[PDB]
Design an enzyme around this catalytic site. Structure first.
Site, PDB file in Angstrom:
ATOM      1  N   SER A  43      11.547  69.241  68.985  1.00  0.00           N
ATOM      2  CA  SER A  43      12.843  68.929  68.398  1.00  0.00           C
ATOM      3  C   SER A  43      13.501  70.079  67.657  1.00  0.00           C
ATOM      4  O   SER A  43      14.654  69.923  67.254  1.00  0.00           O
ATOM      5  CB  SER A  43      12.740  67.743  67.453  1.00  0.00           C
ATOM      6  OG  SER A  43      12.596  66.550  68.201  1.00  0.00           O
ATOM      7  N   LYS A  46      16.963  71.095  68.821  1.00  0.00           N
ATOM      8  CA  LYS A  46      18.181  70.355  68.496  1.00  0.00           C
ATOM      9  C   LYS A  46      19.138  71.199  67.677  1.00  0.00           C
ATOM     10  O   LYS A  46      20.358  70.999  67.750  1.00  0.00           O
ATOM     11  CB  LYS A  46      17.829  69.038  67.797  1.00  0.00           C
ATOM     12  CG  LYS A  46      17.040  68.090  68.708  1.00  0.00           C
ATOM     13  CD  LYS A  46      16.543  66.844  68.045  1.00  0.00           C
ATOM     14  CE  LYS A  46      15.990  65.885  69.099  1.00  0.00           C
ATOM     15  NZ  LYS A  46      14.996  64.926  68.652  1.00  0.00           N
ATOM     16  N   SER A 103      16.385  63.414  63.883  1.00  0.00           N
ATOM     17  CA  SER A 103      15.719  63.805  65.113  1.00  0.00           C
ATOM     18  C   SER A 103      15.948  62.796  66.233  1.00  0.00           C
ATOM     19  O   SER A 103      15.096  62.584  67.081  1.00  0.00           O
ATOM     20  CB  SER A 103      14.233  64.060  64.884  1.00  0.00           C
ATOM     21  OG  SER A 103      13.767  64.999  65.823  1.00  0.00           O
ATOM     22  N   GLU A 139      15.603  65.183  76.733  1.00  0.00           N
ATOM     23  CA  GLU A 139      14.659  64.295  76.050  1.00  0.00           C
ATOM     24  C   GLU A 139      14.331  63.109  76.946  1.00  0.00           C
ATOM     25  O   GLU A 139      15.223  62.569  77.610  1.00  0.00           O
ATOM     26  CB  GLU A 139      15.251  63.772  74.730  1.00  0.00           C
ATOM     27  CG  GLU A 139      15.592  64.844  73.715  1.00  0.00           C
ATOM     28  CD  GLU A 139      14.375  65.378  73.008  1.00  0.00           C
ATOM     29  OE1 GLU A 139      13.258  64.923  73.351  1.00  0.00           O
ATOM     30  OE2 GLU A 139      14.540  66.241  72.108  1.00  0.00           O
ATOM     31  N   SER A 210       7.997  67.787  66.856  1.00  0.00           N
ATOM     32  CA  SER A 210       6.645  67.418  67.233  1.00  0.00           C
ATOM     33  C   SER A 210       6.626  67.046  68.707  1.00  0.00           C
ATOM     34  O   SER A 210       7.648  66.689  69.298  1.00  0.00           O
ATOM     35  CB  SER A 210       6.118  66.273  66.353  1.00  0.00           C
ATOM     36  OG  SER A 210       6.901  65.120  66.539  1.00  0.00           O
TER      37      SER A 210
END
EC number: 3.5.2.6
Length: 261
Positions: A43, A46, A103, A139, A210
């Protein structure tokens, strides 16, 4: 160096592979540990997608207010904010905040789509001088974190330099940079990572990540009081696909860095 010896000891105690890059903006000095090795970003990527949309808003001045539909089919594995707006809309600003501060993975995919795919996010990195970052997937598959796989990776050195440029430098316009800083400072997911190893007095803006293989990451800008800001990147990954997250390793790396001021 003493800091490099303690980081190596921390890594040995942890059983995984640790990557660290610190930039001290006071003298532009850098501390690196595995600084040129590739790590899965998870993440932390992002931040790049949000910054790329902010860059678009320099010319499309109301882009951040544009409503974007959230449909049931858009929901992926972790959508804390987008779930609250299914069958409604969120603006690109709201999606950027959700991706960064919670997230949210649906929000990230909407940002990727706005940029024309992963190649549009990677293109923005190239445009600001980052030749290392690569985003290849959406994702949630970008988090597979397979050992040796170059997809969806960067190096600690490259991400530290890029994060510096985006937040403290002038890769973005003034209003855009201030907005990114505001979003990072308001992150909700970082309490147990870099922040936990630093003086409670320092202001931090960060983005965690993660993934599989126990991958546990955090990238941060740090404003200590009466002292120039620091940029700190901590990446960590482990040899077992099902390994548990180790946010404590990131806190300990930050504490070791902060000891040496």
């Amino acid at each position: 160096s003493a800091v490099q010896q303690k980081l190596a000891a921390l890594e040995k105690s942890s059983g995984g592979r640790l990557g660290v890059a610190l930039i001290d903006t006071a003298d532009n000095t850098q501390v690196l540990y595995r600084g040129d090795e590739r790590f899965p970003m998870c993440s932390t990527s992002k931040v790049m997608a949000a910054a790329a949309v902010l860059k678009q808003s320099e010319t499309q001045k109301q882009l951040l207010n544009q409503p974007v539909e959230i449909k049931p089919a858009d929901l992926v594995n972790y959508n804390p904010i987008a779930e609250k707006h299914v069958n409604g809309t969120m603006t690109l600003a709201e999606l950027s905040a959700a991706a960064l501060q919670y997230s949210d993975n649906t929000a990230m995919n909407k940002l990727i789509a706005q940029l024309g795919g992963p190649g549009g996010v990677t293109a923005f990195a190239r445009a600001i001088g980052d030749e290392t970052f690569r985003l290849d997937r959406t994702e949630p598959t970008l988090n597979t974190a397979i050992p040796g796989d170059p997809r969806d990776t960067t190096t600690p050195r490259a991400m530290a330099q890029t994060l510096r440029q985006l937040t403290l430098g002038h890769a973005l316009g003034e209003t855009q940079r201030a907005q990114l800083v505001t979003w990072l400072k308001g992150n909700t997911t970082g309490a147990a990572s870099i922040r936990a190893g630093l003086p409670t007095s320092w202001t931090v803006g960060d983005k965690t990540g993660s993934g599989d293989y126990g991958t546990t990451n955090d990238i941060a800008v740090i404003w200590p009081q009466g002292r120039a800001p620091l940029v700190l990147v901590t990446y960590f990954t482990q040899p077992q696909q099902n390994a548990e997250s180790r946010r404590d390793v990131l806190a300990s790396a930050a504490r070791i860095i902060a000891e040496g001021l």
